[PDB]
Design an enzyme around this catalytic site. Sequence first.
Site, short mmCIF file in Angstrom:
data_model
loop_
_atom_site.label_atom_id
_atom_site.label_comp_id
_atom_site.label_asym_id
_atom_site.label_seq_id
_atom_site.Cartn_x
_atom_site.Cartn_y
_atom_site.Cartn_z
N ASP A 81 -25.00 -49.59 86.97
CA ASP A 81 -24.05 -49.30 88.05
C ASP A 81 -22.87 -50.28 87.99
O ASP A 81 -22.98 -51.41 88.47
CB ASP A 81 -24.77 -49.41 89.40
CG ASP A 81 -23.86 -49.13 90.57
OD1 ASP A 81 -22.75 -48.60 90.35
OD2 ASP A 81 -24.28 -49.39 91.72
N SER B 162 -4.65 -45.66 87.68
CA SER B 162 -4.31 -44.52 86.84
C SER B 162 -2.84 -44.18 87.02
O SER B 162 -2.26 -44.39 88.09
CB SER B 162 -5.21 -43.32 87.18
OG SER B 162 -4.78 -42.13 86.54
#
Length: 330
Positions: A35, A199
């Site tokens: 994770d 992004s």
Amino acid sequence: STGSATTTPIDSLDDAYITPVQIGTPAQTLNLDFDTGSSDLWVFSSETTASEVDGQTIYTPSKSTTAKLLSGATWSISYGDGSSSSGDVYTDTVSVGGLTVTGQAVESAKKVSSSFTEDSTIDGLLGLAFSTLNTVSPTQQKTFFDNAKASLDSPVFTADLGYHAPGTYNFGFIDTTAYTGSITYTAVSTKQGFWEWTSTGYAVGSGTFKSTSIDGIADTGTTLLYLPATVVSAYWAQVSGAKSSSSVGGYVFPCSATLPSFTFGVGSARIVIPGDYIDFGPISTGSSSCFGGIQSSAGIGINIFGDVALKAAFVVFNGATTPTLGFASK
């Protein structure tokens, strides 16, 4: 040193991925959910409330000659999906794919929430976010990666998740045969303890690319792709019959649909998520309403590049002094 381990979807939907981990002496092998959005290595154990264990393999520290109680240490964690676990702490030897860390904090669960109990395939979590998020008190503990780092050939790990197929976590090296083209690296902020990056935009299907900054985290422990409501609305508007359902808890779409791809930007590079990766199947057994793999982050408070996005790429988690993230097509 290096390590290399295969990671396998837990079910037909890729709801999560498990990776075998050796703990203790002699080895006890548990299948853990790696994770990158958390920083505790915790396991089902001989100390876990019996009624909360349903099929998981447990770590038994009393059977390990290298286990030592970390006296006074406790832990307690709550995840984004509302699940939680807590307990006490041992140190022991932990190996992943041939890479060994001695003195690793192994957090033994006394209590787990229902979602963990109900998932018989996940024996615990191995956190790979920054150690500043580790919940052990009063002495915060380091992640497996942080402990391994100085011994690694290169201070990196990579995630190569499969679509309905196994994949690979590598530690300490970049497998140049595992991706196509070049890797594009992008800046990381560790301010919130996550692999947080920005992004450069998105496209829906064959549509034009929209240049826009989207801050979010690379999180292997989250199943879906959670993005701003504007972005998600633009995606689902291209699917006839798709709608946001408050009763179901997100966007759903007719199971008869063909989903468009979704592209996200990494610097000047582009990662394309095929439409099929965005299909999470019937909302309930036999239903013709299917659950979408791109959902709104509104009310999460953070955008999350979860497995839906990451499994479309070869992803480098660069833990050098100035961390960065790399993405390549594959």
